[PDB]
Amino acid sequence: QTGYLTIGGQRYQAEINDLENLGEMGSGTCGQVWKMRFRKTGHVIAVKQMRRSGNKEENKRILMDLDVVLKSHDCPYIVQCFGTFITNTDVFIAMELMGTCAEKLKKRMQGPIPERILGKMTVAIVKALYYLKEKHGVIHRDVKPSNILLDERGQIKLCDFGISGRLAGCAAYMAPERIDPIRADVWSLGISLVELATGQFPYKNCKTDFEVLTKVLQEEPPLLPGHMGFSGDFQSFVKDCLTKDHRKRPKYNKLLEHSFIKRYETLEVDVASWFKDVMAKT
Numbered sequence: 601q602t603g604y605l606t607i608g609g610q611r612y613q614a615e616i617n618d619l620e621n622l623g624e625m626g627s628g629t630c631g632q633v634w635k636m637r638f639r640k641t642g643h644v645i646a647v648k649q650m651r652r653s654g655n656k657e658e659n660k661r662i663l664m665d666l667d668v669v670l671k672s673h674d675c676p677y678i679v680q681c682f683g684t685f686i687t688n689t690d691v692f693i694a695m696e697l698m699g700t701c702a703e704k705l706k707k708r709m710q711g712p713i714p715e716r717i718l719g720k721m722t723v724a725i726v727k728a729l730y731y732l733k734e735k736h737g738v739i740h741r742d743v744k745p746s747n748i749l750l751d752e753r754g755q756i757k758l759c760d761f762g763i764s765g766r767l768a769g770c771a772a773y774m775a776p777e778r779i780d781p782i783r784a785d786v787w788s789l790g791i792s793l794v795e796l797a798t799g800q801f802p803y804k805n806c807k808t809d810f811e812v813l814t815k816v817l818q819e820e821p822p823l824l825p826g827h828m829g830f831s832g833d834f835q836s837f838v839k840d841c842l843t844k845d846h847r848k849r850p851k852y853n854k855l856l857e858h859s860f861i862k863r864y865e866t867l868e869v870d871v872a873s874w875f876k877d878v879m880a881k882t
């Protein structure tokens with residue numbers, strides 16, 4: 601159904617006129633994402649506007665992402681949908697208003713991201729990918745820092761399922777078996793962890809996409825450096841995530857039992873204040 605907004609257990613009958621446009625969020629999108637304030641409850645939400653006049657391929661990925669998000673209402677590690685509005689010319693998709701992605705966080709930091717923040721990020725992303733494979737049999741196929749969203753309250757969720765499968769992403773984070781033919785998102789997560797932990801994308805100085813694919817297959821997996829104080833569990837988790845042979849790469853339920861994940865499930869990391877600190881320096 602449409603015309604409703606479920607923000608915090610309570611449902612609210614609403615139309616597009618009940619939301620005040622506070623401006624466009626982000627310059628480059630897969631569809632116009634607006635910051636909007638719900639006049640009836642003061643809630644500020646993120647509303648993606650899909651025009652029926654828009655691009656055919658872009659609208660297909662928007663609906664595919666919306667399909668997965670509507671199915672993931674019980675996963676706390678996936679950005680939640682609040683409702684939809686279908687007009688004669690547009691489709692508005694209201695979603696959880698996050699802060700920013702991990703890519704923009706890396707640009708604002710102008711350096712590495714602490715391990716304690718990446719530890720909480722790993723636990724959230726791995727469980728989100730595990731929820732898609734078991735509860736819905738869905739593969740993400742585009743795990744990257746730009747698809748990891750954080751907010752003022754320390755939440756870390758996964759966001760874009762535009763090219764998700766039911767069982768091609770960015771070439772920079774593609775697994776070897778996806779270039780030269782299940783657990784391909786595990787490799788993408790490992791590549792994203794190295795980029796955020798070092799501040800430098802591991803495959804450096806690649807002018808074309810095919811050259812990146814060449815380095816993925818020809819070069820050794822880019823492991824975590826050993827002169828940055830990374831814990832033994834962090835370097836161990838990245839090594840298993842970046843196993844070249846996918847048959848030896850651990851499935852999720854073995855990853856969820858890794859000492860790196862088990863540590864940051866119980867550990868109390870103040871991601872909310874670290875996020876608020878970095879955001880104060882643009």
Ligand SMILES: */C=C/C(=O)N1CCC[C@@H](n2nc(-c3cccc4ccccc34)c3c(N)ncnc32)C1
Pocket residue numbers: 625626627628629633646647648665693694695696697698699700701702703704745746747759760761
């Ligand atoms: C690195 C991510 C980033 O820079 N951008 C541009 C700014 C806005 C970011 N973003 N996207 C959404 C969003 C909301 C609803 C549905 C979907 C579906 C697929 C991809 C993104 C989204 C954002 C929300 N809700 N909140 C903050 N930022 C959002 C993407």
